[PDB]
Amino acid sequence: KPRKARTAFSDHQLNQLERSFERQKYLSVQDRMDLAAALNLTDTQVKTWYQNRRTKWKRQT
DNA sequence: CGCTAATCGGTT
DNA sequence: AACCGATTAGCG
């Protein structure tokens, strides 16, 4: 069952994703597309990163 | 083993 | 179409 390679986010990308999450728990389609483009990530990579980050936030609360 | 990226099926 | 919760799985 082929899967995608695990993305290794740069420190710059993780820093900017965490910054975005501190500002907004969810992104609009537009804001997700803008952040993806700004970080040279796919829309899916940013969507999944935000989904998993909300899961972690739920657990740590 | 812990952290977390990616995948699956169900919910809305 | 995006999310959620459960799950699978890569790597330090």
Numbering used by the authors: 231 to 291
How did the manuscript describe this experimental structure?
Transcription factors (TFs) recognize specific bases within their DNA-binding motifs, with each base contributing nearly independently to total binding energy. However, the energetic contributions of particular dinucleotides can deviate strongly from the additive approximation, indicating that some TFs can specifically recognize DNA dinucleotides. Here we solved high-resolution (<1 Å) structures of MYF5 and BARHL2 bound to DNAs containing sets of dinucleotides that have different affinities to the proteins. The dinucleotides were recognized either enthalpically, by an extensive water network that connects the adjacent bases to the TF, or entropically, by a hydrophobic patch that maintained interfacial water mobility.
Another sequence, DNATC is also only one Hamming distance away from both local optima but has an even weaker affinity to BARHL2 than DNAAT. The recognition pattern appears to be a mixture of DNATT and DNAAC, with the hydrophobic contact of DNATT between C7 of T7 and the methyl group of Thr278 retained but at a sub-optimal distance (4.3 Å). The water molecules are arranged near Asn282 in a somewhat similar pattern to those observed in DNAAC, with the water net connecting the side-chain oxygens of Thr285 and Asn282 and N7 and O6 of G17 (opposite to C of AC). Thus, DNATC combines aspects of recognition from DNATT and DNAAC, but both types of interactions are less optimal, explaining the relatively low affinity of the BARHL2–DNATC complex.
